[PDB]
């Protein structure tokens, strides 16, 4: 009755879970369209909303709920299983039910996460241009010891053009591209110098409102695999700095090809958490 989505064994999160490290006491903020807290396969312990007229613990889009289940779907007899199923999960609503938002809303979310002692931020989101406010917020969060993870973008490739979006393109943020279940790069996955690692982003099964499940594509789906991997590493090694967690993830990744298209390759959290 519980399904293990393919991304869990692909990144070797099952191997780390078997050692007993499942993300307990690690605080992960999902900056997104909210999370359906009443989902049977998710526990949301806190959060905040920066979208007027929307609560933090609901999700009228579904995207934030999907992202959250990749990180943290509960280990039980139903639904799916997260990368780090014992994580303390915080819904930080920075996008409305249409799945869009202002950069001021994202900055508010990053600031909340930094102030409230989050260990990991996931941002399965991006825009085409930077803002200095956004850069200041992610730079500060990383400097204060938050592991900041974001989807690299779904702009594909076009010759030698850099298609990484923001905040993934900032050097304080881990830009995560997408592979599929054969470990091949998804055609939509953004490319460029700032691409850091890959994770599963094609045909990813996870939680979805209301009380159901869905299969979605995007670097949005890859990012939470890495945020969850960071949480597993910290549950095993609680005294690591954010840069130590980040370097473990990139230095132990499985090389797939040219760094322009794959960064350092597919994360291997078993190797990263050694």
């Amino acid at each position: 009755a519980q399904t293990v989505p393919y991304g869990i064994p692909l990144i070797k999160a099952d191997k780390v879970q078997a050692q007993g490290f499942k993300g307990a006491n690690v605080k992960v903020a999902v900056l997104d369209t909210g999370i359906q807290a009443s989902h049977p396969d998710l526990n949301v312990v806190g959060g905040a909303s920066f979208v007027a007229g929307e609560a933090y613990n609901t999700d009228g889009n579904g995207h934030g709920t999907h992202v959250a289940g990749t990180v943290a779907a509960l280990d039980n007899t139903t639904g799916v299983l997260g990368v780090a199923p014992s994580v303390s999960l915080y819904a930080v609503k920075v996008l409305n039910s249409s799945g869009s938002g202002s950069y001021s809303g994202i900055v508010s979310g990053i600031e909340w996460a930094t102030t409230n002692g989050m260990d990991v931020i996931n941002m399965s989101l991006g825009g085409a241009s930077g803002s200095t406010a956004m850069k200041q917020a992610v730079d500060n969060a990383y400097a204060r010891g938050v592991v900041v993870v974001a989807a690299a973008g779904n702009s594909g490739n076009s010759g030698s053009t850099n298609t990484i979006g923001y905040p993934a393109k900032y050097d304080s943020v881990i830009a995560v591209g997408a592979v599929d279940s054969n470990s091949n790069r998804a055609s939509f996955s953004s490319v460029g110098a700032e691409l850091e690692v890959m994770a599963p982003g094609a045909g990813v099964y996870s939680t979805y409102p209301t009380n159901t499940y869905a299969t979605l594509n995007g670097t949005s789906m890859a990012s939470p695999h890495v945020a969850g991997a960071a949480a597993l590493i910290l549950s095993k090694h609680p005294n690591l700095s954010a840069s130590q967690v980040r370097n473990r993830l990139s230095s132990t990744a499985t090389y797939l090809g040219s760094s322009f298209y794959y960064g350092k390759g597919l994360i291997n959290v078993e190797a990263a958490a050694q």
């Binding site: 997104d32 369209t33 889009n61 995207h63 920075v94 996008l95 249409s98 799945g99 869009s100 938002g101 202002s102 950069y103 809303g105 994202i106 399965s124 989101l125 991006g126 825009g127 085409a128 241009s129 989807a151 973008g153 779904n154 702009s155 594909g156 979006g165 998804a186 939509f188 979605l216 594509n217 995007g218 670097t219 949005s220 789906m221 990012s223």
Partner: protein, 51 residues
């Protein structure tokens, strides 16, 4: 596709592609509508899905 509220520069990064009149695949409705306002109204929708 309704682009009335745009620009709204932050978008989810779910891939649900649209193909523009510029022969570029936009990752989702939000990415497309932000590109329309930057265009400035020159970009239109060819069809849903990849180009």
């Amino acid at each position: 596709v309704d682009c009335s509220e745009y620009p709204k520069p932050a978008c989810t990064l779910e891939y649900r592609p649209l193909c523009g009149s510029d022969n570029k695949t936009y990752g989702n409705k939000c990415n497309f509508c932000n590109a329309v306002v930057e265009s400035n109204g020159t970009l239109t929708l060819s069809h849903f899905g990849k180009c």
